[PDB]
Design a protein around this ligand. Sequence first.
Ligand code: SF4
Ligand code: SF4
Ligand code: FCO
Ligand SMILES: [Cl-]
Ligand SMILES: [Fe+2]
Ligand code: NI
Lengths: 277, 481
Amino acid sequence: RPPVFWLQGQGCTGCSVTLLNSVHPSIADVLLKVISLEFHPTVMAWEGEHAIEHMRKVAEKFKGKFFLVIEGSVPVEADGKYCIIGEANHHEISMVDALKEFGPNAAAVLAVGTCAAYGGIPAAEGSETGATAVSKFLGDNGIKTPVVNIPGCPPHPDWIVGTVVLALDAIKKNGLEGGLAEVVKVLDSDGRPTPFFGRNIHENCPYLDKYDEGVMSATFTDKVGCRYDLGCKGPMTMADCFERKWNGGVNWCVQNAVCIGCVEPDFPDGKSPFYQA
Amino acid sequence: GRTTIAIDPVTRIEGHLKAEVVVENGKVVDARLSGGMYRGFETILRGRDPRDASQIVQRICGVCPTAHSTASVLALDEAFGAKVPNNGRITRNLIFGANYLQSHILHFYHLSAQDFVQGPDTAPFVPRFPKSDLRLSKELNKAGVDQYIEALEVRRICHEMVALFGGRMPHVQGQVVGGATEIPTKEKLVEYAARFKKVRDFVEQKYVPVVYTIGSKYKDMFKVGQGFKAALCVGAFPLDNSGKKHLFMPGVYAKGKDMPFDPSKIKEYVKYSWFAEETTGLNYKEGKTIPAPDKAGAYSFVKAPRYDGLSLEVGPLARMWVNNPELSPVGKKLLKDLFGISAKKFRDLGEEAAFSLMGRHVARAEETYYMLGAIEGWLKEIKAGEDTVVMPAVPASAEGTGFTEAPRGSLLHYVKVKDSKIDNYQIVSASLWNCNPRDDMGQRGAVEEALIGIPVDDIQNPVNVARLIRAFDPXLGCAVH
Ligand code: SF4
Ligand code: SF4
Ligand code: FCO
Ligand SMILES: [Cl-]
Ligand SMILES: [Fe+2]
Ligand code: NI
């Protein structure tokens, strides 16, 4: 049962919260039987340098075998000072330093959320922290550990759990190394698993007929027309929200309002203004 | 004689926090809180279409995004001159109210309960301090574990409630300038009410009773954590369309006195914060956010907000104290049976016990019950099919301020619009009021002060430092933004 360490950089904890909303039949087993969530600052029992040292002892015992979940971007300006994640016997550990320490020794890294995947809101125009995507940061620092991106702001819990399931099945079938190689084959050019991000929202939208007819809603509460004029970014967005919907299937963004393209590498600036085409 | 203890990360909170305390003769005698992660939303927002704010700001915090959504759309409503339709006002209350339920349940069970309840021998419930001061009987400890598990379901259902009219959660799509984007249907109102009944039953039968019952085994924890005994509420959940009656009415309480809230008395100091010295002491309408991560003497990315010079706290205790509602039936009964206390209204707990480590947990449970009544009312008030939004034009020049109460306390957003774009956007949030560093005059932040006197009889197992902090339910994403 491999350990998982969940490190957050410049995130909003939305990736943890979205996972707490999972109704995936496998999630309890993932946490109780398949892996061991040894470090997670939002929910773990211990604290402080003790929690950091616990993670370090586990990481040493499972060198090459543990998994990192990284949420949030990694800020490089000011020598990493815009994100400190812990302190060990007076020595501060920035997100930069944490990834330089643990990154080389992980079996793989899951970059969860658009911030970790692509930079996201912390990297957007007007920011000043040098917010950097996980894969870019690791590459820039010569760390070749495999990274899978599971974006969204936040991701749907099914994308996170589903990617874990994909990986589990691949690793059972071909071993750690070979398994990861099979996972690579089903990633798109932005490092996203194609089962969840391989279809365009707009091509699969229930309002596509209205789009084609040129019937556009002029107020959000008109649910008959297409939402394009209200700012819907479905045409430029690769995600399966149209099918699984959100929060136990009770709604989704296009039904409720508009898609804002939250899974895309240019989010938010390339998807803004949100409420104009 | 003095021992300094540093805790980084403080866990079972949201976000990045370091606490440093000095312990002497078994008690905390000094404290410093450091918010260690910064993003800079107030500068990221500049130059954008102001309507984008009501999406961007939610990413300050995935635990309380509906609060930021609310504050933002209220600011935008003012700046745009938008009159939210009655049914949209109520819809917004239903979207946001449901996350109060989610957030308080998450906080007590998934963040706080391990402070008092021993988890099983599996990660992430072990390892932990060898002497964790976990006092509950076999039976009551098991009830805590069982309810933590059940609460995973309940908090998830609360987010389903949020998403019914909000689109999804975290990060609702359904609140915009001018109201709410989806008119409630009869069928979806039935769905919301079915879930709400499950949540109500859990709150009434499990959550409220367990907080009092666990509290009755930790009566010592009502005797510490008082801090300044000063509180702020800025109002929340409008109950009419004329901006006066609210579920929580505004007010300030300090030195035993109640006074009105005047937002012009807010100033944010930065001497001990990693921001440029010249930006100290600004009211939010003139706020500036210029990071200075190397500035000597500073120790946090949280600014230091003060109300007419006072360091105040916010959250359920603040609101319940300021508004002084009647206590829940189950609370009244357990106060009698377990504590020997006859109490009718919240202030009957007395100031000392209310403003305490355990008092804050009690206030949050009581407030969860209080919110059930409000949501029940809104489910009767809402009208299926009635329009919930107007579609205002973007003004070229305007300003607006949105005031509300996030689950952790007072929140305001201020926007200034120039050339149809955001010229300034300033946020003064709940955990900013609680978890801030010293101001320029050396006055501690609310939680820093509440740490003073906290018992640490065992420096190898200093569990009460973070227990105190967790009582305030911090989220440092909010505090720093
Ligand atoms: S623009 Fe949006 S609402 Fe219209 S068809 Fe495309 S995805 Fe659907
Ligand atoms: S519909 Fe669009 S904005 Fe909503 S979750 Fe899916 S990709 Fe993100
Ligand atoms: N609740 C919440 Fe978030 C914080 N602190 C805000 O405002
Ligand atoms: Cl909220
Ligand atoms: Fe601010
Ligand atoms: Ni928050």
